[PDB]
């Protein structure tokens, strides 16, 4: 039946007995693509019956559906014209892993971050209302995403529309790990009272409410969804789904199966089984030790403990000293700041792309008060996650231009661990550390253990004519540029490990004027608002020439990394070529 689904109209042609068979067909096809190609396993298997019912009852694209995150919209794409991308291995990559309007009229937003569906959906509804449309507007949002303040604001506003607004809460009792927040006790009393409970968070927020206990039964959902169709006021449809339904291993281990690398369908084991530790593992190793020796130390995550190497066992080990605040980046920062104000030693670890949510809290809650909380920022690089919503391109311009902030850029493992140890020990600054997005590199030479004199860059090779400031993960690159500059142009360049993203070594920059005419900067991130521009500004009235290397200010999506680097001149021979072109 699935081979003949080209739009929601074809879904409406089926009998209910046929809808159930289609559910099976979808799961078979998902099992193949997801085991071969990786992806969000649990969220999509759990969403099968609700997506069929959604496109059975509603008339997309007049009616519009918005998924929170969109990591769970595979079945949506499967039923709106993109099935061939899931049935034929040769076409696995013809769709992104998130919603995309360029692919389909059935997709209204590129979405990857959490708790944004409800807000964007109310945008659609208000737009309808101002222009006299009459379509249904649906947001689909996970129970974990409910912990984000943007979703609270969206619900708050939705309760005021006075018009059609449909909010499907997909309650599978799981975020990535387990949920956290007192709200989840409310969700729970409601499931147990079959939606009957008087004290209802959603009703307290001003909204109407209905509950569906069998979130994996096409009939129940069609029933539910038909009841709310063409409704004229805001309503919540709270449904209970079983995360990863239809695949035993997923049902028994929900955290592991939220996202899988390619694996064996029969055993569930990954296809490539060797792994060497990454900086996440290291970091978990360090904090479990420190937290044992020093009861003031507390590790914090916003719904992504794995970014800190914190398996369910390790969380258990850490007990009261490991905190998961839900998907609430804003709060994580203010919490860290208050902890540090009343004698605790907080360490908040977060992805670069997600820390984008907390600019004002970093600035006001944290830095105005100058509290010594520690922030670890992971995966900041131009060569990592490469879909547009998860681009870790912007943390240097996000963070490094805030007053009072100290942002450190380690280049190797012992240095990373030394700044982190010093971070916890000091009491004078908020400290953020850009965890290197590389394999774990051994420093091989003893490293400074005190970073209290700010903005001292470390010369690692005395040279002349050209100086290279190779920041963080791009130290390796500065090293290769040094070699190739020597072998092809016989320039012996000064190589510099800057360490401090948040300031300029004025005195060294001055000393370089003597035996150098060109300084270049390499940074693993976008150029606008980043580190290199400060160097350009410092030399602006002097006879020192400067080149800045990094990523251009532009969105890119599922790109080839070799290209993107070359396109931005981030290769050793492109850099040396540019130097000589400037020198002569």
Q: Tell me the window of 73-81, 165-173, 457-465, 489-497 that interacts with Mg ion (CB under 5 A).
A: 165-173
CA–CA dist 440, 281 (Å, integer): 10
User: Which residue from 171, 164, 154 is spatially nearest to 229, judged by alpha carbons?
Assistant: 164
Among 258, 315, 331, 413, indicate the residue that binds ligand TPP (CB under 6 A).
258
Among 31, 87, 205, 220, indicate the residue that binds its own copies (CB under 8 A).
205
Quick one: what does residue 145 bind among Mg ion, its own copies, ligand TPP, none, with the CB cut-off 5 to 8 Å set by partner type?
ligand TPP
Strand partners, 171: 240
Residues 366-425 touching its own copies, rule: CB under 8 A, are 367-369, 388-389, 394, 397-398, 400-404
Among 260, 357, 429, 434, indicate the residue that binds its own copies (CB under 8 A).
357
Residue 145 contacts its own copies per CB under 8 A:
no
Among 48, 95, 121, 509, indicate the residue that binds its own copies (CB under 8 A).
121
Strand partners, 209: 236
Residues 228-257 touching ligand TPP, rule: CB under 6 A, are 243
Which residue has 């990592």 as its token pair?
Answer: 384
Cβ neighbors of 399 (< 8 A, separation 6 or more) are 355, 362, 375, 377, 405, 407, 432, 501
CA–CA dist 362, 563 (Å, integer): 34
- The answer to whether 389 and 351 are in contact (CB under 8 A) is no
Q: Tell me the window of 3-11, 154-162, 241-249, 505-513 that interacts with its own copies (CB under 8 A).
A: 154-162
Residue 42 contacts Mg ion per CB under 5 A:
no
Cβ proximity to ligand TPP: between 258 and 429 the closer is 258
Cβ proximity to its own copies: between 182 and 446 the closer is 182
HEC readout, 486-524: HHHHCCCCEEEECCECCCCCHHHHHHCCCCEEEEEEEEE
Quick one: what does residue 205 bind among Mg ion, ligand TPP, its own copies, none, with the CB cut-off 5 to 8 Å set by partner type?
its own copies
Residue 181 contacts its own copies per CB under 8 A:
yes
Q: Tell me the window of 113-121, 212-220, 242-250, 562-570 that interacts with its own copies (CB under 8 A).
A: 113-121
Residue 144 annotated as binding site: yes
Helix (H, G, I), strand (E, B) or coil at 240: strand
Among 178, 251, 317, 528, indicate the residue that binds its own copies (CB under 8 A).
528
List the structure tokens of 237: 């449809």
**Do the strands 494-497 and 458-461 form a parallel or antiparallel pair, or are they unpaired?**
antiparallel
Cβ proximity to Mg ion: between 238 and 499 the closer is 238
List the structure tokens of 27: 């799961």
Quick one: what does residue 114 bind among its own copies, ligand TPP, Mg ion, none, with the CB cut-off 5 to 8 Å set by partner type?
ligand TPP
Residue 44 contacts Mg ion per CB under 5 A:
no
User: Which residue from 176, 156, 121, 570 is spatially nearest to 354, judged by alpha carbons?
Assistant: 176
Cβ proximity to Mg ion: between 72 and 80 the closer is 72
Cβ neighbors of 65 (< 8 A, separation 6 or more) are 54, 58, 76, 106, 108, 138, 139, 140
Quick one: what does residue 258 bind among ligand TPP, Mg ion, its own copies, none, with the CB cut-off 5 to 8 Å set by partner type?
ligand TPP
Residue 114 annotated as binding site: yes
Burial class (CB in 10 A: 0-12, 13-18, 19+), 102: exposed
* Residues binding Mg ion: number (CB under 5 A): 5
List the structure tokens of 360: 């004002």
Q: Tell me the window of 24-32, 183-191, 213-221, 427-435 that interacts with its own copies (CB under 8 A).
A: 183-191
Residue 142 contacts Mg ion per CB under 5 A:
yes
CA–CA dist 315, 325 (Å, integer): 13
User: In whole angstroms, what separates CA 237 from the centre of its chain?
Assistant: 27
Burial class (CB in 10 A: 0-12, 13-18, 19+), 90: exposed
Residue 112 annotated as binding site: yes
Cβ proximity to ligand TPP: between 179 and 494 the closer is 179
Residue 354 annotated as binding site: yes
Among 1, 259, 359, 559, indicate the residue that binds its own copies (CB under 8 A).
359
Residue 143 contacts ligand TPP per CB under 6 A:
yes
> Ramachandran region of residue 370, left (φ > 0), alpha (ψ -120 to 50) or beta?
left
The DSSP output letter for 113 is S
In this structure, is the dihedral angle defined by the CA atoms of residues 261, 526, 299 and 286, taken in order, positive or negative?
A: positive
Residue 337 contacts its own copies per CB under 8 A:
yes
Residue 503 annotated as binding site: no
What is the nearest approach in angstroms of ligand TPP to the Cβ of residue 154?
14
Task: Compute, in degrees rounded to 10, the torsion defined by CA atoms 501, 505, 511, 517.
Answer: 30
Residue 174 contacts ligand TPP per CB under 6 A:
yes
Residue 76 contacts ligand TPP per CB under 6 A:
no
User: Which residue from 6, 513, 28 is spatially nearest to 246, judged by alpha carbons?
Assistant: 28
Residue 463 annotated as binding site: no
Give me the 540-569 binding string for its own copies, x by CB under 8 A, dash otherwise. xxx--xxxx----xxx--------------
Residues 317-336 touching ligand TPP, rule: CB under 6 A, are 327
Cβ proximity to Mg ion: between 171 and 217 the closer is 171
- The answer to whether 283 and 291 are in contact (CB under 8 A) is no
Residue 58 annotated as binding site: no
CA–CA dist 475, 461 (Å, integer): 12
Residue 71 annotated as binding site: yes
Residue 143 contacts Mg ion per CB under 5 A:
yes
* Residues binding ligand TPP: number (CB under 6 A): 22
Binding-site members for Mg(2+) are 143, 172, 174
Binding-site members for thiamine diphosphate are 71, 112, 114, 144-145, 172, 243, 258, 354
State the residues that interact with ligand TPP by CB under 6 A.
Answer: 43, 69, 71-72, 112-114, 142-145, 172, 174-176, 243, 258, 303-304, 327, 354, 357
């Amino acid at each position: 039946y699935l081979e003949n689904i080209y739009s929601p109209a074809d879904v409406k042609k089926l009998s209910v007995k046929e809808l159930n068979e289609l559910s099976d067909e979808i799961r078979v096809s998902l099992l193949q693509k997801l085991s071969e190609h990786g992806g969000h396993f649990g969220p999509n298997f759990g969403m099968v019956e609700a997506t069929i019912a959604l496109h059975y009852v509603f008339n997309s694209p007049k009616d519009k559906i918005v998924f929170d995150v969109s990591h769970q919209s595979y079945v949506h794409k499967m039923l709106t014209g993109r099935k061939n991308a899931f049935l034929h291995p040769e076409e696995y990559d013809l769709v992104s892993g998130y919603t995309e309007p360029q692919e389909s009229e059935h997709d209204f937003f590129v979405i990857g971050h959490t708790s944004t569906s409800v807000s964007l959906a109310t945008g659609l509804a208000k737009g309808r209302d101002l222009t006299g449309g009459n379509e249904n507007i649906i947001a689909v949002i996970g129970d974990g995403s409910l912990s984000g303040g943007e979703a609270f604001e969206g619900l708050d506003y939705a309760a005021e529309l006075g018009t059609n607004m449909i909010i499907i809460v997909n309650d599978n009792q799981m975020s990535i790990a387990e949920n956290h927040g007192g709200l989840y006790r409310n969700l729970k009393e409601l499931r147990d009272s079959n939606g009957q409970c008087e004290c209802n968070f959603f009703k307290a927020m001003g909204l109407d409410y209905i509950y569906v206990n069998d979130g994996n039964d096409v009939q129940a959902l069609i029933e539910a969804f038909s009841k709310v169709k063409d409704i004229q006021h805001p309503i919540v449809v709270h449904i209970n789904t079983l995360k990863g339904k239809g695949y035993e291993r997923a049902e028994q281990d929900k955290e592991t199966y939220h996202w899988r690398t390619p694996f064996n369908p029969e055993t569930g084991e990954a296809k490539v089984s060797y792994e060497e530790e990454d900086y996440s593992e290291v970091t978990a190793q360090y904090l479990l030790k420190k937290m044992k020796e020093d009861s003031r130390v507390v590790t914090i995550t916003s719904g992504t403990p794995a970014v800190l190497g914190f398996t369910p066992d390790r969380r258990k080990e850490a007990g009261k000293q490991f905190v998961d605040v839900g998907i609430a980046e804003e709060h994580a920062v203010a919490l860290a700041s208050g902890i540090a104000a009343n004698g605790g030693k907080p360490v908040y670890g977060v992805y670069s792309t997600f820390i984008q949510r907390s600019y004002d809290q970093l600035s006001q809650d944290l830095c105005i008060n100058n509290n010594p909380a520690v922030l670890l920022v992971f995966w900041g690089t131009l060569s990592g996650m490469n879909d547009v919503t998860h681009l870790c391109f912007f943390d240097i311009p996000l963070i490094s231009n805030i007053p009072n902030m100290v942002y450190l850029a380690p280049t190797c493992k012992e240095e990373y661990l030394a700044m982190l140890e010093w971070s916890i020990r000091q009491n004078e600054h908020p400290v953020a550390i850009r965890v290197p997005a590389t394999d774990v590199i051994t420093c091989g030479e003893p490293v400074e253990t005190d970073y209290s004199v700010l903005n001292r860059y470390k010369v690692t090779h005395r040279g002349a004519k050209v100086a290279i400031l190779a920041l963080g993960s791009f130290y390796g690159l500065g090293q290769s540029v040094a070699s190739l500059l020597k072998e092809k142009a016989n320039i012996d360049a000064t190589l510099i490990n800057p360490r401090y993203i948040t300031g300029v070594d004025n005195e060294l920059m001055d000393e370089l004027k003597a035996d150098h005419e060109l300084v270049i900067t390499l940074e693993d991130g976008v150029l606008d608002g980043g580190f290199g521009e400060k160097i350009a500004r410092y030399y602006g009235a002097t006879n020192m020439k400067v080149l800045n290397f990094g990523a251009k200010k532009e969105f890119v999506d599922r790109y080839d990394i070799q290209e993107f680097l070359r396109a931005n001149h981030l290769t050793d021979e492109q850099i040396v070529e540019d130097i000589t072109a400037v020198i002569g």
